Design an enzyme around this catalytic site. Structure first.
Site, PDB file in Angstrom:
ATOM      1  N   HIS A  38       0.815  -1.208   0.000  1.00 48.02           N
ATOM      2  CA  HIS A  38       0.000   0.000   0.000  1.00 48.02           C
ATOM      3  C   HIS A  38       0.852   1.263   0.000  1.00 48.02           C
ATOM      4  CE1 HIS A  38       0.702  -0.112   4.428  1.00 48.02           C
ATOM      5  NE2 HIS A  38       0.705   1.197   4.251  1.00 48.02           N
ATOM      6  N   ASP A  71      -0.467  -7.632   1.429  1.00 46.43           N
ATOM      7  CA  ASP A  71       0.113  -6.289   1.408  1.00 46.43           C
ATOM      8  C   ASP A  71       1.634  -6.407   1.469  1.00 46.43           C
ATOM      9  OD1 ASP A  71       0.442  -3.575   1.422  1.00 46.43           O
ATOM     10  OD2 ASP A  71      -0.260  -3.291   3.485  1.00 46.43           O
ATOM     11  N   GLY A 126       3.629   6.058   9.405  1.00 44.27           N
ATOM     12  CA  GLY A 126       5.047   6.060   9.128  1.00 44.27           C
ATOM     13  C   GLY A 126       5.744   4.756   9.436  1.00 44.27           C
ATOM     14  N   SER A 163       4.405   1.795   8.469  1.00 45.32           N
ATOM     15  CA  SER A 163       4.036   0.837   7.434  1.00 45.32           C
ATOM     16  C   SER A 163       5.266   0.373   6.666  1.00 45.32           C
ATOM     17  CB  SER A 163       3.015   1.450   6.474  1.00 45.32           C
ATOM     18  OG  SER A 163       1.696   1.161   6.907  1.00 45.32           O
ATOM     19  N   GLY A 164       5.232  -0.886   6.236  1.00 39.28           N
ATOM     20  CA  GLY A 164       6.301  -1.454   5.454  1.00 39.28           C
ATOM     21  C   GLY A 164       7.430  -2.037   6.275  1.00 39.28           C
TER      22      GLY A 164
END
Lengths: 241, 67
Positions: free
Chosen positions: A53, A98, A189, A191-192
């Protein structure tokens, strides 16, 4: 993999500062202006894993080896992205599957503050109730307009998908794993970035920060991409490229 | 800002019970009671509420001018 040259010390909302360099696979994703919008994990010298995303493109840059993003004296590597492999099964409405892989245009130079996390096998069993760790530069307070400069960390338990559905219902899919609801939370912030659990003494990537409460509530669980459900696609993507 | 939801997935029930799939950045619908977001910047947010009614489909109908 998964063995940091600088040992993390564990006593993100209600987290704590990481020991500098102690999460050497944690990278920052930054746009052309140098702004951090997402995290990622190095899985070897040439590949980074992050969330689908995040919308990473080849105009974004992978930054490795940072602890204090407000510092200009750390020995950091700004790594261009040659190719983006966004999992074609990623659904932007359900947020399932994701995961995205980033092929670096030049190889990272591993050192005391830069190295790889371990990947699990698709058959690995990470038990509900296990204490794992997530790290990132996301908000430390939902009201904030200011991420922290220093890499944060928190310890938090894994949930079963059965218990996670009691919070989020049919939003929870098999390619998702939940953690938290324990006084800490991933936040904007993060995410990932990684959710890691120590398997046979080696930090192993069990989850990828994905989504959760819109206010980063510390009494609801965060939802992560379940790496065991996606790692064969990761390994096959690497083998083919 | 007043309520609105473009896509309203009402379901099998009497009275109805509906679910909006609209993606909104930064935050949800002002009258959403339970909102989820991706932990990115900007966050991609969704309302997971279940109401027995839909809000006006945000976008106008654009079909009242031509005879």
């Amino acid at each position: 993999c998964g063995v940091p040259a600088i040992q993390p010390v564990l006593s993100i909302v209600n987290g704590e500062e990481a020991v500098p360099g102690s999460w050497p696979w944690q990278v920052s994703l930054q746009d052309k202006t140098g702004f951090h919008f997402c995290g990622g994990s190095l899985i070897n010298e040439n590949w980074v894993v992050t969330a689908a995303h995040c919308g990473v493109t080849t105009s974004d840059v992978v930054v490795a080896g940072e602890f204090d993003q407000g510092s200009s004296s750390e020995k950091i590597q700004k790594l261009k992205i040659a190719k983006v492999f966004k999992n074609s099964k990623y659904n932007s409405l359900t947020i399932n599957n994701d995961i995205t892989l980033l092929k670096l245009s030049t190889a990272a130079s591993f050192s005391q503050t830069v190295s790889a996390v371990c990947l699990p096998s698709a058959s690995d069993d990470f038990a509900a109730g296990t204490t794992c760790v997530t790290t990132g530069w996301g908000l430390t307070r939902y009201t904030n307009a200011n991420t922290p400069d220093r890499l944060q960390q928190a310890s938090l338990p894994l949930l079963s998908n059965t218990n996670c559905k009691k919070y989020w219902g049919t939003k929870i899919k098999d390619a998702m794993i939940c953690a938290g609801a324990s006084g800490v939370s991933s936040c904007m912030g993060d995410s990932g970035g990684p959710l890691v659990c120590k398997k046979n003494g080696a930090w192993t990537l069990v989850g990828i920060v994905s989504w959760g409460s819109s206010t980063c509530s510390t009494s609801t669980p965060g939802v992560y991409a379940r790496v065991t459900a996606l790692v064969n696609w990761v390994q096959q993507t690497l083998a083919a490229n | 800002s007043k309520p609105c939801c473009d896509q309203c997935a009402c379901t099998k029930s009497n009275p109805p019970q509906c679910r909006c799939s609209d993606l909104r950045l930064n935050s949800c619908h002002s009258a959403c009671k339970s909102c989820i977001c991706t932990f990115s910047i900007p966050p991609q947010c969704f309302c997971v509420d279940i109401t027995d009614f839909c809000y006006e489909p945000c976008k106008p109908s654009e079909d009242d001018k031509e005879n």
